[PDB]
From a paper:
DExD/H-box RNA helicases, from virus and bacteria to eukaryotes, play important roles in processes including ribosome biogenesis, RNA processing and folding, ribonucleoprotein (RNP) remodeling, RNA nuclear export, the regulation of RNA translation and transcription, and nonsense-mediated RNA decay. DExD/H-box proteins often contain accessory regulatory domains and localization modules, but their cores consist of two RecA-like domains joined by a short flexible linker. The N-terminal domain is commonly referred to as conserved domain-1, or DEAD-domain, and the C-terminal domain as conserved domain-2, or helicase domain. Both domains contribute to the binding site for RNA substrates and both contribute to ATP hydrolysis. We used X-ray crystallography to determine the structures of the DEAD-domains of DDX2A, DDX2B, DDX5, DDX10, DDX18, DDX20, DDX47, DDX52, and DDX53, as well as the helicase domains of DDX25 and DDX41.
DDX25 (GRTH) is a testis specific, gonadotropin and androgen regulated protein that is essential for completion of spermatogenesis. The two helicase domains have a sequence identity of 23% and their structures superimpose with an r.m.s.d. of 3 Å. The helicase domain contributes to nucleotide coordination via motifs V and VI. A superposition of DDX19 with the DDX25 and DDX41 helicase domains shows that in the latter two structures part of motif VI is not visible in the electron density, indicating its flexibility. The conserved motifs IV and VI superpose well, whereas motif V shows different conformations in all three structures. In the free helicase domain structures motif V, an important RNA backbone interaction site is in a binding incompetent conformation.
Author numbering: 307 to 417, 420 to 435, 440 to 476
Write the structure that this text describes.
């Protein structure tokens, strides 16, 4: 059920400060609705939360520190639209990827060394056109190149100047 018939992009970012700056540029560039944002670490997910709260976004955070009931409440609320941005460390979108989500952002590329193809697919593929962004520091390009060869779908490049 699960393919890649969605527009994929990457942005080159020096450090997380630039990743968020870029993410802000996306927000001031197109209509959102709902978005999922995936991070590799608790520390980074937590950080992006604080960042977005300080910019008015209503964010909920799905880290691993949460109890079953806390996870239940976050997820239920995001599904029926009470939150707009869901930041998670979850390796996969299952349960959360409702129809209302237009954007998905890999705030960290799902990476011993090899990139995780099914993680990438579960995050970004769906089960009438999606949008997905990869926030990447210069030297993650080799992995991204592999992710692209693997799926034979091109991941286009953007900068601090969004057009589409
Ligand atoms: Cl962590
Ligand atoms: Cl399913
Ligand atoms: Zn999954």
């Amino acid at each position: 059920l699960t393919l890649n018939n969605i527009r994929q992009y990457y942005v080159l970012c020096e450090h997380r400060k630039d990743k968020y700056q870029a993410l802000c540029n996306i927000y001031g560039s197109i209509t959102i609705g709902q978005a999922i944002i995936f991070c590799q670490t608790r520390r980074n997910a937590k950080w992006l939360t604080v960042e977005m709260i300080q910019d008015g976004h209503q964010v909920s955070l799905l880290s691993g520190e949460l109890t079953v009931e806390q996870r239940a409440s976050i997820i239920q609320r995001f599904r029926d639209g009470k939150e707009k941005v869901l930041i998670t460390t979850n390796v996969c979108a299952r349960g959360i990827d409702v129809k209302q989500v237009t954007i998905v952002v890999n705030f960290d590329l799902p990476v011993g060394e090899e990139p995780d193809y099914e993680t990438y697919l579960h995050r970004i593929g769906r089960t009438k056109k999606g949008l997905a962004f990869n926030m990447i520091e210069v030297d993650e390009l080799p992995s991204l190149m592999k992710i692209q060869d693997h799926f034979n779908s091109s991941i286009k490049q953007l900068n601090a100047e969004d057009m589409d």
